[PDB]
């Protein structure tokens, strides 16, 4: 059975932690050697990934323990530079174990691809024409990516949003709603936006300008929930109930004040970004989606919610875009990203997204607990 | 004296780029050696930075060339994993040199510390008591950090904000406004928040709960602007004037649509975050301050503006929080972070923040210019890139993928196609 409980990792050396992980996760001896020596990313490989490469930049690579998601333990690799982050994630995950861990879910892996049409004098009418022709546009979008279609992904729907008065004239904006399966999906969806452009121009009689995914991936949401009783939260000097009221004080402060919410959401991303980096995923894309979603209400606010259930237990919840992949980009190119994803042992990118959402929620809890405990 | 031009860098091997950087920057043999071998971050040193360390994780480390900020050349190290990001920064920086590079400025390095006060039944009245006690509170905040006060920083002002109707009761929130000089300032500012809490509790009669910085560092703004004439932007297949109009088409899209603005601002952070990472700074803090700032107006929108000047030259401008440091955190623990500061030859944190805003502005320009001028049908450069990918041995879906990277890298040649194809076949 997979077990995310780490035995006294603070008292082991880095080498002993590495051997424990290689043992528990069944890494090959060649994978173990890959972790034992610096330079897992060959310079010639890095050189083919970005430009003007002259070396490599190391981040500390840690692992958060105790995470249990939908009944299944998972080890969480974290590449980050900041103290306390990994420890807080682990400790809050240990508290969450007492109710059975985190409960998560997600939408389908739906990415938006935007197609900007300019010069349409009747954008409202043209919108209706595009929507009428949607089957044809979906067909055209799906003709090239045989691998994605064969997996059951591809363009599933289209939307059209009209901006009839702009300094550049009216804009008609087609959104292709694309299932990208286990990829983050940016390149996947950009190609479809480019492919549908002649057909969109013919239908609208306009000129297509930008063909590009939206990073506000609010149709690819990950959701996570945790519950903690006062018994679980009680310490020697503070009662579980007192800690709980202090956490709600801290949360509401983030809910109503963007100056606090920015900080509150930053602590969430302390949890999430290190998993994104360690698995070879684009962290700028996850950061953009999270913080943009945080202002969907008209005001920048908390991505999490903290409440009490009928019996007084603390309930935290999170919902946010989670565009991530088990394939594509660097996720299978960087040898340690391949290795980190093997440590986590996941079947879908949704699973990775749900685990990320849980890690963020625990990280947020760790901050709120600490900030409300600390004495004057 | 400082030169940021990287001649023939596309054709050089990583080792040669390294040796060039060492000479151009006057690095010591100890510094050049640290670049020569992997493991610049010793495991035992990593072990002291975060918890539960079992190794280290490498990002590709590149350098963007051609950048010139307020008349000074500066090389920009960039740690990132995504193709074409480093290339777009360099190429737009190169076009930027024609008008003289970038012009930048910043505000004072002012950070906010929040002191949340609960249980006050007259929050409005108690706010006026706190504001009256301004000097006493400021002196309290400045009583411990003697090094910072001696440098010219310290708590300079306060603000009080009242939330009279919340499910947790009324909230009175004191902001300490602290000049943190060359540090990121989270610790400095947190400590002051703790320091004034008993005095704030005395004045208001309330209970202080959170004592914490605001990552919404809108008193610590970096600003950068750039100008490019039609002549500078002209290409063989497109006039400068129609590229300028295209960029304007793309910019307004981001200004009005949050679905486009998010991607537009993500591209800005493609330029900024890798500098943040390479200099040992907290990228989560920079991400938080940028994206929260982007919705200050009530709607999530662009962090940059793109316009034309009187004679029709494209003008781009950017303004955003930039909480970064040259001291503290990992910027002096990590040996490469220390070295990256030496390569940039930075005199202050403000200067690091202005450079990054310029890199972010340049990245945005590269993205907008590319997206707006991409042909509806494959043009002759795109077809040439496919042929180059084919001759280098690409097949199936690899052809378009390699050719896409080559074109976006402005490095459409067979030797590059070989390096990029080998990367893809490392999957
Ligand atoms: N603003 C942005 O976020 C943005 C924009 C452009 C590019 N990027 C970069 O795009 C890259 C990610 O693009 P991508 O995610 O499309 O990956 P990719 O282009 O490397 O791979 C996508 C392809 O993988 C194939 N595939 C095989 N197995 C699959 C599976 N199980 N599920 C889904 N697809 C499968 C599919 O044919 C699909 O087309 C990153 O490097 C990112 O930085 C980001
Ligand atoms: N949400 C957040 O952003 C957050 C929250 C908590 C902690 N952190 C972490 O805090 C750390 C950074 O805080 P910090 O910047 O105060 O670093 P720091 O902890 O090293 O403190 C800076 C100290 O160095 C001294 N100093 C010496 N030279 C100085 C100079 N030229 N200018 C200013 N101060 C000088 C000062 O006395 C100052 O107090 C980061 O690691 C960050 O990840 C971030």
């Amino acid at each position: 059975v997979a077990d995310s409980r780490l035995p006294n990792f603070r008292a082991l050396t880095p080498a002993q932690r590495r051997d424990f992980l290689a043992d528990a996760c069944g890494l090959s001896d060649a994978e173990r050697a890959l972790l034992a020596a610096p330079g897992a990313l060959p310079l010639a490989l890095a050189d083919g990934m970005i430009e003007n490469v002259f070396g490599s930049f190391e981040l500390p690579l840690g692992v958060a323990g105790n995470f249990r998601v939908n009944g299944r333990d998972v080890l969480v690799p974290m590449a980050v530079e900041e103290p306390s982050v990994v420890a807080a994630a682990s400790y809050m995950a240990k508290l969450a174990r007492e109710d059975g861990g985190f409960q998560t879910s997600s939408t389908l892996p739906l990415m938006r691809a935007q197609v900007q049409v300019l010069g349409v004098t009747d954008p409202h009418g043209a919108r209706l024409a595009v929507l009428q022709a949607r089957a044809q546009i979906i067909e055209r979008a799906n003709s090239r990516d045989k691998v994605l279609i064969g997996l059951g992904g591809g363009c599933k729907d289209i939307e059209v949003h009209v901006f009839p008065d702009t300094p550049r004239g009216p804009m008609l904006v087609v959104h292709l709603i694309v299932d990208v399966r286990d990829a983050m999906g940016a390149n996947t969806v950009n190609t479809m936006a480019e492919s549908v452009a002649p057909l969109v121009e013919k239908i609208t009689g306009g000129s297509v300008r930008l063909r590009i995914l939206s990073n506000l991936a609010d149709l690819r949401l990950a959701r996570a929930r945790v519950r903690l009783t006062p018994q679980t939260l009680a310490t020697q000097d503070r009662s579980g109930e007192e800690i709980i009221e202090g956490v709600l004080d801290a949360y509401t402060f983030a809910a109503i004040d963007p100056y606090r919410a920015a900080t509150h959401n930053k602590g969430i991303m302390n949890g999430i970004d290190p998993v994104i980096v360690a698995t070879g995923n684009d962290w700028r894309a996850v950061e953009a989606g999270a913080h943009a979603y945080a202002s969907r209400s008209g005001s920048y606010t908390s991505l999490t919610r903290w409440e009490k259930d009928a019996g007084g237990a603390l309930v935290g919840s999170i919902e946010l875009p989670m565009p991530v992949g088990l394939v594509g980009g660097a996720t299978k190119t960087h040898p340690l990203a391949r290795l980190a994803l093997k440590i986590m042992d996941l079947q879908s990118a949704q699973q990775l997204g749900e685990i990320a959402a849980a890690v963020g929620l625990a990280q947020n809890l760790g901050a709120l607990r600490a900030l409300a405990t600390e004495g004057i």
Side-chain angles (χ1 to χ4, degrees), chain A:
Chain A
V1 183
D3 195 341
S4 72
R5 275 166 313 210
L6 305 167
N8 303 299
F9 256 35
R10 292 280 65 219
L12 300 167
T13 71
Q16 294 168 329
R17 302 180 189 121
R18 171 187 74 236
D19 285 324
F20 185 90
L21 293 178
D23 293 344
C25 302
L27 305 189
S28 68
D29 272 314
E31 281 162 355
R32 193 187 303 251
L34 195 69
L35 286 166
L41 188 64
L43 207 60
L45 179 51
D47 185 57
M49 292 171 66
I50 69 169
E51 307 76 43
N52 298 345
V53 164
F54 68 95
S56 59
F57 188 92
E58 286 168 298
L59 287 157
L61 177 56
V63 48
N66 302 310
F67 274 99
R68 186 167 175 93
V69 174
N70 288 355
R72 168 197 190 253
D73 283 7
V74 51
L75 291 165
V76 180
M78 294 177 83
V80 79
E81 86 299 330
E82 177 175 357
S84 307
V85 176
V86 175
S90 310
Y91 183 41
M92 291 303 104
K94 187 170 182 178
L95 290 178
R97 286 193 89 98
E98 292 194 27
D99 198 65
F102 300 81
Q103 295 290 325
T104 61
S105 69
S106 52
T107 66
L108 296 162
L110 301 188
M111 292 298 266
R112 292 169 189 276
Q114 293 192 296
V115 177
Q116 174 193 31
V117 197
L118 300 183
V120 182
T121 55
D122 61 323
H124 296 301
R127 166 165 177 281
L128 292 207
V130 173
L131 292 174
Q132 184 175 21
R134 76 141 160 244
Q136 187 186 357
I137 297 165
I138 290 176
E139 172 77 4
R140 181 57 199 266
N142 280 336
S143 64
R144 269 92 137 167
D145 201 327
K146 323 298 266 173
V147 165
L148 178 72
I149 301 309
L151 289 163
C155 180
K156 306 291 176 181
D157 208 358
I158 77 160
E159 294 176 1
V160 183
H161 304 268
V162 170
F163 304 81
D165 188 24
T166 87
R168 317 297 303 170
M171 311 196 167
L172 183 147
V173 183
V174 186
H175 296 216
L176 308 172
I177 312 306
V178 180
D179 185 311
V180 303
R181 292 286 90 188
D182 297 306
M184 180 254 174
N187 287 323
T188 308
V189 118
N190 287 349
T191 298
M192 293 171 169
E194 300 157 6
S195 294
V196 299
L199 167 62
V200 167
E201 283 191 351
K202 177 182 202 172
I203 297 168
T204 66
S207 289
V208 164
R209 188 68 70 258
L210 257 49
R211 294 131 281 169
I212 194 61
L213 82 155
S214 174
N215 278 112
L216 174 41
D218 60 6
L219 300 175
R220 189 166 181 187
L221 303 168
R223 309 172 164 125
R225 173 195 191 278
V226 72
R227 193 187 85 114
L228 295 92
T229 60
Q231 289 65 234
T232 301
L233 285 167
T235 76
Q236 322 94 71
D237 41 324
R238 298 130 312 182
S239 79
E241 291 78 4
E242 278 144 50
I243 296 179
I244 287 176
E245 300 303 309
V247 163
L248 302 171
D249 290 342
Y251 152 71
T252 293
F253 184 21
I256 62 175
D257 183 10
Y259 285 105
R260 170 61 194 156
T263 318
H264 169 114
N265 284 353
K266 191 272 197 189
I268 296 178
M269 303 313 296
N270 284 352
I272 293 186
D273 285 21
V275 192
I276 305 309
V277 180
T279 59
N281 275 276
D282 181 338
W283 81 74
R284 283 89 49 210
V286 179
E287 280 277 6
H291 286 286
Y293 197 71
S295 34
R296 66 193 186 282
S297 77
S299 185
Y300 184 91
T301 189
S302 167
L303 291 161
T304 51
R305 307 280 190 283
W306 287 99
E307 301 160 314
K308 280 186 288 183
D309 70 8
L314 182 65
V315 179
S317 48
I318 188 161
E319 186 187 68
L320 50 10
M322 198 50 70
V324 298
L326 310 176
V327 295
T331 60
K332 289 188 145 176
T333 299
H334 190 308
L336 280 198
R338 292 208 306 275
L339 190 40
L341 291 160
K342 189 186 167 179
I343 289 168
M344 307 181 79
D345 183 26
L346 300 170
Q347 323 305 326
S348 65
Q350 282 182 250
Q351 212 170 345
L352 172 55
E354 297 177 26
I355 298 173
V359 169
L361 187 64
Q363 195 72 46
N364 179 227
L365 173 62
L368 301 193
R369 190 185 95 96
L371 293 174
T373 69
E374 69 173 316
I376 177 175

